[PDB]
Amino acid sequence: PIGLHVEKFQQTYRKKWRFLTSANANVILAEAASGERPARWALTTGMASIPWEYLFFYMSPAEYNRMKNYPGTFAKSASVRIRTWNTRVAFATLNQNKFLQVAKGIRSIPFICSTNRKYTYSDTEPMQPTGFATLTSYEYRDGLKTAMYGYDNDNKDFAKKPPADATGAEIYLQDYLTIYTNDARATTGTKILAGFPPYKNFIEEFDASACINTDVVAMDYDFSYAPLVPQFAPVPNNLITQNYNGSYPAGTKNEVTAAKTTDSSQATAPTQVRNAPRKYIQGPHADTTFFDEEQNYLRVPIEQGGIFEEVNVETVHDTQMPSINVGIRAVPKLTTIDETTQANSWLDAQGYFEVDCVLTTESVDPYTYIKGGCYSANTKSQLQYFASDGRPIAKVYDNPNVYGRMQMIKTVKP
Amino acid sequence: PIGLHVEKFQQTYRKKWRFLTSANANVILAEAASGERPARWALTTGMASIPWEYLFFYMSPAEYNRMKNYPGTFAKSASVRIRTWNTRVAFATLNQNKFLQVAKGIRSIPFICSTNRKYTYSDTEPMQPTGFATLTSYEYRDGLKTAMYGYDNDNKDFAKKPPADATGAEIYLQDYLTIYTNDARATTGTKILAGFPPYKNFIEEFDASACINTDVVAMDYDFSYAPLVPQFAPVPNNLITQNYNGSYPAGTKNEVTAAKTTDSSQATAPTQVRNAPRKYIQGPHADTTFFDEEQNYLRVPIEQGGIFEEVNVETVHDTQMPSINVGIRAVPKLTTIDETTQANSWLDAQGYFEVDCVLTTESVDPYTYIKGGCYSANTKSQLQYFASDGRPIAKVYDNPNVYGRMQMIKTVKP
Amino acid sequence: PIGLHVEKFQQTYRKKWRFLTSANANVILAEAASGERPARWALTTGMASIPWEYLFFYMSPAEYNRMKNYPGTFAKSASVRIRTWNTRVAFATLNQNKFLQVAKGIRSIPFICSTNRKYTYSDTEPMQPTGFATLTSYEYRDGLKTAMYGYDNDNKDFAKKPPADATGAEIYLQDYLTIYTNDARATTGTKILAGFPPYKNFIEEFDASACINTDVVAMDYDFSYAPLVPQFAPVPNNLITQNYNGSYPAGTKNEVTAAKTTDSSQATAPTQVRNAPRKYIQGPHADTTFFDEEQNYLRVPIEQGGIFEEVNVETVHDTQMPSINVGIRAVPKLTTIDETTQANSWLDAQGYFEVDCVLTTESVDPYTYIKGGCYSANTKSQLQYFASDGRPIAKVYDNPNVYGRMQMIKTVKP
Amino acid sequence: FQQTYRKKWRFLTSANANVILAEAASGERPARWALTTGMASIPWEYLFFYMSPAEYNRMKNYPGTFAKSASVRIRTWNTRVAFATLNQNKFLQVAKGIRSIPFICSTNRKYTYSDTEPMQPTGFATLTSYEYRDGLKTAMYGYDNDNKDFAKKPPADATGAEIYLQDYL
C-alpha cells in the first residue's frame, strides 16, 4: 500500500532591511475620550516596532502573488536578526552618551497597557512628541510596505518611493512604543491614582557606542497554525453519500474550538462560547474574503492559531508572537539656564538597525482522486470564525492585550 | 482495611471458520438516487468483509445467553488470524495467475467512500456483478450467523442450514467491498469530475499460489469501552440522602461526553453538543432495550467507545475497529475474438480462508452491601445515548465514514 | 529586565490539642423523613471526626485577623499527627480489651453513606446512643473553636470556657461517624433490602493497650486552590482601553470552569453547565461576603478547588481532603442474666488523642505600578461561584458524598 | 521543485502468429508486405503512462517544468495457453530499440483476426497509434463522472486490473 501521492514543497523567503529610529523623548501626552475609549495619559518612548509578525516583512508582492498558486501553504517558521550600527547624534557639544533600548514581549505583559503610535513633533524640538498623528497601525505597515517595494509602474507617484528591496536604502520608522495610564482628572467616584507602571524594568538597555555593528536581537518563532493559502477543496461526500450530515461521539475531548470573552471592567464574568459562527474557507459554500480581499499580507499577523479550525481531531490553542521594539534613548540637552529638574530639550539622535528576516513556508498537493486535479481529504477542511455580518474574524496585534492575550477582531474591508 | 469483596472473572471465546469468496470482477454499477441518497457510480471488488467486529463471530448463542448472566461484562480484547489455502480456478485453460487482495482499514480512510454490498450476477458470467441485491449488512450478518450456528430444533427449516460450528464446513461470503463516486450525468451547476479514487494503492496484493496455506492477516484489537452486559445496579442514594441531586465542580475538565455533528455538504459548520439525551442502563429508571432487544450480538459492533458514559471521572474518546476485507483478484478470460481493451469475461475463482478468532471478556461482582445481592458503587453507573423517540443510539460500521469516523445511528427494533 | 517587585511571604501555624472520645456503642437509630430527607436507619460508631480541614484547627482568631491583612494568601499545605495515649475504662471488672479504630477517607467512599453526628445518650447507659442531638456540624465546629480559644473578655459567659490553646486541657468530641441505610418499612413498590454496608472492612483497628503513647495517624495534604484572602485588585483596564470587553480564542481547551450536577435517583441524566453564575472577589464590582461574613474560618473547609476561578489559563480540577475519624471500640458489659446474643450494656471508655497540626500558607505583594499601593496583574483576578440570590457557593464536607464527590452548597449568612 | 510520478500496470498480450499481410498503395504510401509479430509496444515514451489526468492538470500550474528522467521495469508472470494438448513450449520475445534500426522498417499496428484462428492476423484495423494510446489512457483512468459510457471502462489505476494491448510490432 503506497498510499496517497502527496507532493510536498518547502519555500524560504529572505529579506534584509535598514531601519532608522528617532531617539524620541519620554513625554506625557493627553489623549481625550472618544466613544468607548476613555481619557488617558500617554507616555511615549523611542522604541520603534519591528513588524516581523506580518507577511510583507518577508515576502515581496511578486512572491506573495506566486504563493497564491500553492493551496495548503502554512508558514512553518520565522526568524529575525537585528544588528545595530553607529548612532547619529546632532552637534554644539562633543561628548555623547548613547544607550540602546530593546523591548521584547512588552505587548504580552498584562499590567502594561501599550500600543505602537505615530507622534507629532514640535518645530523647535524634533525629538519631543507633542501629539498623535492620525496614522493607524495598518497605514503604518502599508506605508512601510510601499517604502520596501515601491509602487506599480503605472502609478502617478511612482518616482516618489524608490524600492528599498531594490536599493538597500534606509527606512525611517514612525510607530513607537507608548504606555498608557488612566486620566482621573474628570473621573467621578473611585479614582485609581497608581500613576505609570515602571516599564523600564522590563526592557534591555545597552551601550550603543560599544554595540555599534553588533547583534542585539535574535528571535525565532515556530507557527502553530498559519494558513497562508487555503487547502485544496475535498470531493464533497454529500454527492456520494446520504451520511454526509451524520454525528459521531466526541467523548470528553473538545474537538470544536471555543471563544473566551473577558470584561476588564468586571461588569460581567468571563464567558466561554462553543460553536461560534464560522464557515469553511474552501469547498462548496466557501467564503474566502479573508484571503481574497486581502488580509494576511500586512493587515493581519501571520500567526492565526485559534482563528482557523479544522474538522480534524487536532487540538487548537491560543497563539501570540512576541513583540520587538528597538530604539535609542533620548539624549538630554538641558542646562542651567533652562532651569528644570527633567530635560525639556534633546539632541537629534538616530539609531541604525540592520534586520535580516527569514520565513519558511511549506505546502502540499494531495492526489486523493484520479481525474480533475488535486483534492484533499475532507479531514483537511478548514473553517474560519466569522461575524454576524459576513465579515471574517482575525487576530490583531495592534490593540493592547486583554489579560495578556491578543484578541479577535472583525476584519475591515480594504 | 480489606475493602470490597469484588469477584473478578475472565472468559475466552474461540471460534474457527472456513470462508469462500468469489473472485468478483471490477465493474461499475449505477445506483440511482433514493430519497437523500444521491445518484452514484459503484465500483465492485472481490474483497469480502470479515465481520470480526461483531459478537456472533466469537460467541455461539449458548455462550451469549450464558454471558447474559454476568452483569458488568466488558470485552477486553479481540484477535483474528486469517490463513489462505488453495484457490480454485475454473477449467478450457491450464496456466493460471492467482492474486490475493488484503485490505485493512479501508473503512476509516476519509476520501475513499466504500461499503460492503451484496451483488447480483449475470447468468452467463457468474463472476460479473450486474446489480445490487436487496440484502442489507444486518441481513448479511444474520444469514452468516444462521450458517454458523443453525436454527432451533423446532424450526420448520431446521434441515436447510447445517451448523458450521458443528461441521467445520465452509461458508460463502456475499458482502464485498464497493467504492462509490459521484454520478454527475444529471448534476446541474458545478460538476465534480474526479472519477474514482485509486483504491488499489491502499490494499495489499499477494501471490495466491505461493500463499497457499499461509497466514495473511493477523489483527489484534483492545477495546476501550465494550459493555456486553450492563453493570450491577447500585443502591440508590436518593433512598438514603436528600443530597442525591447535588452538584459538584468539574473544573476545566470535561466529565460529561459530547457529540460532534458534521456536514460534508458544508451547508453548516460542525457542531459540538454537550449533555445530549441519554439515560441509565441499570437502576431505578433504567432503559435496557439495547441489551434486551437485542443489539450487541450481531446488529451492532462490539466496540462502543463514546456511546456509553459513566458518571465516573474517566475520560471518553471515539473508537473504531479496523476493517478487514480479503479476496481473490478476478481472473480475466478475454481473447482476440471478443475485441476489447479490458476483460469482459472472467474465470470462476474462489478463495479459501481459514479464520481463527479469539475474544477475551471480563466481568465483576461487587459486594458493596451485606444483604440482597451484588450492588455496584454508584460511580459504576452507565448511561447510553438515546434518541427523542426512546430509541437507543449506537455506533455502526455499515455506513461510509464521515470525515474518517464511524457515526452514531438510531438503532432499529428487531 | 528585573521585572516585577513581588514580595513573597511564608507563614506557619502550629496547634496542639488534647481530644477525648467516647467509646460509643454500635446501635441502630431511626431517623424519620423530613422534607426531601427520606426515612433511614442510622448505625452509630465511636469514631469522632477530626476537623483538620478547617482553618480554626490551625489558626487562633488573632492569627486569622492578622492574616486578613495579607491579600493573596493561599494555604499551601496542611499536616496532622494523631498520637494515642492510655484509654480509660470504667471499673466491677478488672480485665479489659481495648481496641482503637482509625478511619481514613470514609467520607469519599461512594457506596458508604456516612456523616458525623452528635448523639443523645440514655441515662442508664452513657455509652448507648438513643437519638440525635439537634447540634449541626457547623455548631459542633463552633463549640469546638470556643473550647479551643475562649470567649472575648467582655462576654457574660467568659468564665465558662477556659481556652484549651492557653491551658493545654482536653476537649471532648461529639460528632461521631454514622452510617445510613434506607428504611423500607413504609416504602411502597420496589424495596431495596441490602441492609448495611460492611464499613468495618474499610477501617483500621489497633490494640489500644499496646498503642498507648503511639502515633496512629500521620496525614499530609497539599492544597490545590485554597484562597484564604482575596488577591490584590488589579488596575482596571477599562479605565485605560476600549478593548476591555474583547474576546480571544480558547481553542480546544476549557479555560472557563464547569459544574456537574448528578441525580442519584436516576430521574435525570448528569449535566455539565459551563459559564455558571459567578462574580469577582476583588476589583470594581467585587463581592466579598464569603471572606467578610465570614466563612473560611470554621464554616467552610480550607480546600476550595473548583469553587474559585481565575481568568488565567490555569487548569482547575475538583478537590477533596481525606476525612479522619478516630475512636475506641465499645467495651461490652453483657452477661448471662441479661440474656442476649449482642451486647446491650457497655463500660464507659474514653480515648486520649494528642493532635499536632501544622498549616503552611503563603502570600504575595505585587508592585505592578509606581503609586498608590499593590496592584496585581489582571490575570490574577479571582471569581467565585454564586447562587441566584447573591449567596456565595462553597464546598462542604458535612453532607454525604455524591458519587464519591463533595458537593457545592449555597453558603449560609452567619 | 522536484516531483515524482509512479504508475503500475498489468498488460496482456496476444501470442500473434507471424503472417504476411498485404498493404495496398494509398497516395504516397506504396504497396508493401507486412510481417506481423506478437510483441506489443509499451508506450513508456508518453506522459499518460506515468501521470493521471489529475496530476497532469496540476502540473499545468508549474511553468518551467522539465521531465528529468523516466524509468520502466517490466516483470513477466505465468503465460496462459489454451487447452486438447498438455505439453507446452512458451517463449518470451523482448525487442529493445527496434524502432531506431535503420534497415528495419517497422511500426506498431493493430490487426484484425480470423474467426477460426484468433491468433492469426488477417488484416489491419483502422485504429491509429494515437487512438491506441487514447484507448489505453481511457482504460487506465476511466471516463468523466458525467460520461454516458462511464460504466463501460473501469479505471485500471483504481482497480489494478489488466489491460489488453493491440499495437504489435
mmCIF file of C-alpha atoms in Angstrom, chain D residues 2-169:
data_model
loop_
_atom_site.group_PDB
_atom_site.id
_atom_site.type_symbol
_atom_site.label_atom_id
_atom_site.label_comp_id
_atom_site.label_asym_id
_atom_site.label_seq_id
_atom_site.Cartn_x
_atom_site.Cartn_y
_atom_site.Cartn_z
ATOM 1 C CA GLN D 2 11.101 18.044 -7.849
ATOM 2 C CA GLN D 3 8.074 15.805 -8.424
ATOM 3 C CA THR D 4 7.827 12.039 -8.929
ATOM 4 C CA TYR D 5 5.002 10.172 -10.677
ATOM 5 C CA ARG D 6 4.745 6.404 -10.258
ATOM 6 C CA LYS D 7 2.338 4.098 -12.050
ATOM 7 C CA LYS D 8 1.915 0.337 -12.162
ATOM 8 C CA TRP D 9 0.109 -1.552 -14.907
ATOM 9 C CA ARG D 10 -0.948 -5.088 -15.809
ATOM 10 C CA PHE D 11 -0.703 -5.818 -19.531
ATOM 11 C CA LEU D 12 -1.965 -8.798 -21.510
ATOM 12 C CA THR D 13 -0.504 -9.520 -24.944
ATOM 13 C CA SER D 14 -1.703 -11.972 -27.577
ATOM 14 C CA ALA D 15 0.727 -14.530 -28.963
ATOM 15 C CA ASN D 16 0.051 -13.441 -32.538
ATOM 16 C CA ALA D 17 1.274 -15.615 -35.379
ATOM 17 C CA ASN D 18 3.929 -14.401 -37.799
ATOM 18 C CA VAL D 19 1.942 -13.977 -41.022
ATOM 19 C CA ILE D 20 2.477 -11.821 -44.101
ATOM 20 C CA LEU D 21 -0.217 -9.217 -44.770
ATOM 21 C CA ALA D 22 -0.588 -7.216 -47.964
ATOM 22 C CA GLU D 23 -0.978 -3.453 -47.575
ATOM 23 C CA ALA D 24 -2.097 -1.711 -50.747
ATOM 24 C CA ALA D 25 -0.741 1.581 -52.033
ATOM 25 C CA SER D 26 -2.531 4.661 -50.706
ATOM 26 C CA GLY D 27 -1.474 8.059 -52.004
ATOM 27 C CA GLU D 28 2.241 8.409 -51.334
ATOM 28 C CA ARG D 29 2.299 5.160 -49.339
ATOM 29 C CA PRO D 30 3.475 2.338 -51.640
ATOM 30 C CA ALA D 31 2.328 -1.261 -51.789
ATOM 31 C CA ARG D 32 4.148 -3.335 -49.192
ATOM 32 C CA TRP D 33 4.206 -6.685 -47.418
ATOM 33 C CA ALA D 34 3.619 -6.638 -43.660
ATOM 34 C CA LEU D 35 5.068 -9.283 -41.340
ATOM 35 C CA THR D 36 3.241 -9.302 -38.006
ATOM 36 C CA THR D 37 4.694 -10.148 -34.607
ATOM 37 C CA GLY D 38 3.318 -10.780 -31.139
ATOM 38 C CA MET D 39 5.461 -8.095 -29.479
ATOM 39 C CA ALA D 40 3.152 -5.410 -28.111
ATOM 40 C CA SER D 41 4.521 -1.880 -27.802
ATOM 41 C CA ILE D 42 4.950 -0.385 -24.323
ATOM 42 C CA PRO D 43 4.117 3.370 -24.581
ATOM 43 C CA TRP D 44 6.619 4.403 -21.908
ATOM 44 C CA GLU D 45 7.577 7.432 -24.036
ATOM 45 C CA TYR D 46 4.312 9.279 -23.311
ATOM 46 C CA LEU D 47 3.229 11.278 -20.286
ATOM 47 C CA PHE D 48 -0.078 9.478 -19.661
ATOM 48 C CA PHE D 49 1.962 6.344 -18.933
ATOM 49 C CA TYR D 50 3.219 7.960 -15.710
ATOM 50 C CA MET D 51 0.703 10.700 -14.899
ATOM 51 C CA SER D 52 -3.010 10.603 -14.234
ATOM 52 C CA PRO D 53 -5.135 13.430 -15.675
ATOM 53 C CA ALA D 54 -5.338 14.961 -12.185
ATOM 54 C CA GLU D 55 -1.550 15.035 -11.840
ATOM 55 C CA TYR D 56 -1.270 16.440 -15.366
ATOM 56 C CA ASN D 57 -3.822 19.198 -14.725
ATOM 57 C CA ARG D 58 -1.947 20.128 -11.552
ATOM 58 C CA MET D 59 1.405 20.043 -13.372
ATOM 59 C CA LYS D 60 -0.086 22.667 -15.682
ATOM 60 C CA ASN D 61 0.217 25.119 -12.772
ATOM 61 C CA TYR D 62 4.019 24.776 -12.673
ATOM 62 C CA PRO D 63 5.621 26.678 -15.572
ATOM 63 C CA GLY D 64 9.189 25.724 -16.339
ATOM 64 C CA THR D 65 8.592 22.015 -15.780
ATOM 65 C CA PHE D 66 11.051 19.655 -17.468
ATOM 66 C CA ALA D 67 10.919 15.883 -17.376
ATOM 67 C CA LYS D 68 14.316 14.916 -15.978
ATOM 68 C CA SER D 69 14.097 11.125 -16.021
ATOM 69 C CA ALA D 70 11.954 8.108 -16.851
ATOM 70 C CA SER D 71 12.352 4.504 -15.752
ATOM 71 C CA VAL D 72 10.427 1.365 -16.655
ATOM 72 C CA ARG D 73 10.590 -2.137 -15.181
ATOM 73 C CA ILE D 74 8.738 -4.987 -16.891
ATOM 74 C CA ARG D 75 8.233 -8.254 -14.992
ATOM 75 C CA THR D 76 6.687 -11.259 -16.697
ATOM 76 C CA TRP D 77 4.300 -13.708 -14.980
ATOM 77 C CA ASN D 78 2.636 -17.014 -15.908
ATOM 78 C CA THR D 79 1.719 -17.392 -19.577
ATOM 79 C CA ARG D 80 -1.759 -18.669 -20.436
ATOM 80 C CA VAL D 81 -2.033 -21.393 -23.087
ATOM 81 C CA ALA D 82 -5.278 -22.790 -24.492
ATOM 82 C CA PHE D 83 -6.089 -26.435 -23.806
ATOM 83 C CA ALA D 84 -6.684 -30.671 -26.318
ATOM 84 C CA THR D 85 -2.951 -30.699 -25.569
ATOM 85 C CA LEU D 86 -0.925 -30.661 -22.357
ATOM 86 C CA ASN D 87 2.796 -30.195 -23.044
ATOM 87 C CA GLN D 88 3.656 -26.606 -23.927
ATOM 88 C CA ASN D 89 6.688 -24.630 -25.090
ATOM 89 C CA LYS D 90 6.398 -20.936 -24.215
ATOM 90 C CA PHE D 91 8.947 -18.341 -25.328
ATOM 91 C CA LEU D 92 9.155 -14.668 -24.382
ATOM 92 C CA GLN D 93 10.242 -12.122 -27.003
ATOM 93 C CA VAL D 94 11.780 -8.814 -25.888
ATOM 94 C CA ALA D 95 12.702 -6.209 -28.516
ATOM 95 C CA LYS D 96 14.574 -3.078 -27.403
ATOM 96 C CA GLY D 97 15.478 -0.321 -29.843
ATOM 97 C CA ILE D 98 13.997 -1.882 -32.985
ATOM 98 C CA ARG D 99 12.459 1.484 -33.872
ATOM 99 C CA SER D 100 15.890 3.104 -34.273
ATOM 100 C CA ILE D 101 17.382 0.380 -36.509
ATOM 101 C CA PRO D 102 17.880 1.972 -39.952
ATOM 102 C CA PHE D 103 17.421 -1.012 -42.275
ATOM 103 C CA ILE D 104 14.414 -2.489 -40.429
ATOM 104 C CA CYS D 105 11.190 -0.725 -41.367
ATOM 105 C CA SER D 106 8.749 -1.375 -38.537
ATOM 106 C CA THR D 107 5.701 0.201 -36.937
ATOM 107 C CA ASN D 108 3.193 -0.774 -34.271
ATOM 108 C CA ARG D 109 -0.136 -1.810 -35.770
ATOM 109 C CA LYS D 110 -3.464 -3.236 -34.648
ATOM 110 C CA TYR D 111 -4.522 -6.377 -36.500
ATOM 111 C CA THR D 112 -7.820 -7.958 -37.408
ATOM 112 C CA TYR D 113 -8.075 -11.653 -36.606
ATOM 113 C CA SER D 114 -9.816 -14.588 -38.246
ATOM 114 C CA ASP D 115 -12.862 -16.058 -36.530
ATOM 115 C CA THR D 116 -11.457 -19.599 -36.676
ATOM 116 C CA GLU D 117 -7.910 -18.602 -35.610
ATOM 117 C CA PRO D 118 -7.900 -15.778 -33.036
ATOM 118 C CA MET D 119 -4.079 -15.884 -33.072
ATOM 119 C CA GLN D 120 -3.854 -15.317 -36.840
ATOM 120 C CA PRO D 121 -3.901 -11.714 -38.093
ATOM 121 C CA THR D 122 -5.877 -11.367 -41.314
ATOM 122 C CA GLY D 123 -5.603 -7.616 -41.857
ATOM 123 C CA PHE D 124 -5.156 -4.217 -40.260
ATOM 124 C CA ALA D 125 -7.650 -2.462 -38.032
ATOM 125 C CA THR D 126 -8.321 1.182 -38.848
ATOM 126 C CA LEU D 127 -7.081 2.138 -35.367
ATOM 127 C CA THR D 128 -4.125 4.511 -35.382
ATOM 128 C CA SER D 129 -1.330 4.826 -32.837
ATOM 129 C CA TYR D 130 -2.895 7.965 -31.359
ATOM 130 C CA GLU D 131 -6.211 6.153 -30.978
ATOM 131 C CA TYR D 132 -4.416 3.151 -29.477
ATOM 132 C CA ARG D 133 -2.806 5.385 -26.855
ATOM 133 C CA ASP D 134 -6.103 7.202 -26.262
ATOM 134 C CA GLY D 135 -7.995 3.966 -25.657
ATOM 135 C CA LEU D 136 -5.135 2.841 -23.433
ATOM 136 C CA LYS D 137 -5.400 6.055 -21.399
ATOM 137 C CA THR D 138 -9.161 5.584 -21.124
ATOM 138 C CA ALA D 139 -8.628 2.033 -19.863
ATOM 139 C CA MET D 140 -6.075 3.278 -17.319
ATOM 140 C CA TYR D 141 -8.002 6.245 -15.946
ATOM 141 C CA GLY D 142 -11.699 5.915 -16.834
ATOM 142 C CA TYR D 143 -14.129 8.484 -18.169
ATOM 143 C CA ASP D 144 -15.525 11.584 -16.510
ATOM 144 C CA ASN D 145 -18.329 11.082 -13.995
ATOM 145 C CA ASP D 146 -20.837 12.710 -16.379
ATOM 146 C CA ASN D 147 -19.986 10.479 -19.354
ATOM 147 C CA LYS D 148 -22.842 8.488 -20.873
ATOM 148 C CA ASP D 149 -20.488 5.487 -21.182
ATOM 149 C CA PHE D 150 -18.778 5.897 -17.797
ATOM 150 C CA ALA D 151 -19.592 2.361 -16.643
ATOM 151 C CA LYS D 152 -18.025 0.711 -19.704
ATOM 152 C CA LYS D 153 -14.421 1.464 -18.673
ATOM 153 C CA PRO D 154 -13.462 0.797 -15.038
ATOM 154 C CA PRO D 155 -10.174 2.554 -14.239
ATOM 155 C CA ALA D 156 -7.126 0.312 -14.104
ATOM 156 C CA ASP D 157 -5.401 2.944 -11.959
ATOM 157 C CA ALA D 158 -8.116 2.319 -9.362
ATOM 158 C CA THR D 159 -8.727 -1.412 -9.741
ATOM 159 C CA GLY D 160 -5.322 -2.878 -10.580
ATOM 160 C CA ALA D 161 -6.860 -4.917 -13.389
ATOM 161 C CA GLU D 162 -5.250 -5.985 -16.647
ATOM 162 C CA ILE D 163 -5.354 -4.163 -19.986
ATOM 163 C CA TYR D 164 -5.055 -5.938 -23.320
ATOM 164 C CA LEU D 165 -2.641 -4.359 -25.818
ATOM 165 C CA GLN D 166 -3.374 -4.155 -29.546
ATOM 166 C CA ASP D 167 -0.407 -2.404 -31.210
ATOM 167 C CA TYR D 168 2.119 -5.103 -32.103
ATOM 168 C CA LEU D 169 5.402 -4.811 -33.960
#
